[PDB]
Amino acid sequence: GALTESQAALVKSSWEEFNANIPKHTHRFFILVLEIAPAAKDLFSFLKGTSEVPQNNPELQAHAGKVFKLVYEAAIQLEVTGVVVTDATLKNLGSVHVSKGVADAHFPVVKEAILKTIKEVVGAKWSEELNSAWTIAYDELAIVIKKEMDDAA
Ligand code: HEM
Ligand SMILES: c1ccc2cnccc2c1
């Protein structure tokens, strides 16, 4: 795909529907992360120590909202420029993920939760095109992050 204007339109659309209920969708997103990889709980500063995932926690909501925002912006960048660019922000993001003990093998985990989160957010308007645009947007932005990471350690 490498994002055609229509895949990019489709990603932009599901992102607003994402963004129309942050508390819900972001709580659902974390539930999904833990179901895939239980042990991932521990790397989150606002998850460990708890039973279940808080529903009205401000840091959780801002951090998961921002994750999704980054992937949607990569998707527009891929369409428009043809590449994902490495700017300050993403290099900062590399150092911070090395800090928190993130590895390359973790990235799949957060991809599948994002895929599944979007499937439930769009409900009947889910297509394979949507699934492939988001796959692509995620995989290109994680290649860039994976790079800054190995440059911070
Ligand atoms: C392209 C995929 C990813 C994106 C866009 C992303 C983005 C972010 C952002 C925006 C933050 C917080 C920004 C800030 O407040 O400075 C962050 C922190 C964090 N990320 Fe990610 N990340 C990605 C992959 C992952 C993966 C694979 C994991 C592993 C579970 C992960 C775990 C973490 C942790 C543990 C923190 C902070 C820890 C804490 O709150 O205790 N990230 N990431
Ligand atoms: C909150 C903060 C950081 C994250 C990074 N990757 C996946 C999920 C996240 C949620």
Architecture overview:
This protein has a single domain (1-153), classed as Globins (Globin-like, Orthogonal Bundle), CATH 1.10.490.10. It is built from six helices and no strands. It starts with a helix and ends with a helix. By secondary structure, it is an all-alpha fold. The chain binds protoporphyrin IX containing FE and isoquinoline (ISQ). The site of protoporphyrin IX containing FE has 21 residues, from helix 3, helix 4, helix 5 and helix 6.
The gist of it:
This protein is an all-alpha fold and 153 residues long. The protein contains six helices and no strands. The longest helix has 25 residues, at 128-152.
Bound molecules: protoporphyrin IX containing FE, isoquinoline
Q: State the distance separating the first and last CA atoms.
A: 33 Å
Sheet of most strands = none
CATH architecture: Orthogonal Bundle
Put simply, the count of helices is: 6
What is the H/E order?
Answer: HHHHHH
Assign a percent range to the helix content. Answer: 55-70%
| Oligomeric organization of the protein chains | monomer
- What would CATH call the homologous superfamily? Globins
Approximately what portion of the residues adopt beta-strand conformation?
A: under 5%
Q: Can you tell me the CATH topology? A: Globin-like
Q: Could you tell me the radius of gyration in angstroms?
A: 15 Å
Q: Give the CATH class.
A: Mainly Alpha
Shape type: globular
Number of strands: 0
The overall number of domains is: 1
Class based on secondary structure composition and strand pairing: mainly alpha
Protein name: Leghemoglobin-2
Family: Belongs to the plant globin family.
Subcellular location: Cytoplasm, Cytosol; Nucleus
InterPro entries: Globin (IPR000971), Globin-like_sf (IPR009050), Globin/Proto (IPR012292), Leghaemoglobin-like (IPR001032), Leghaemoglobin_Fe_BS (IPR019824)
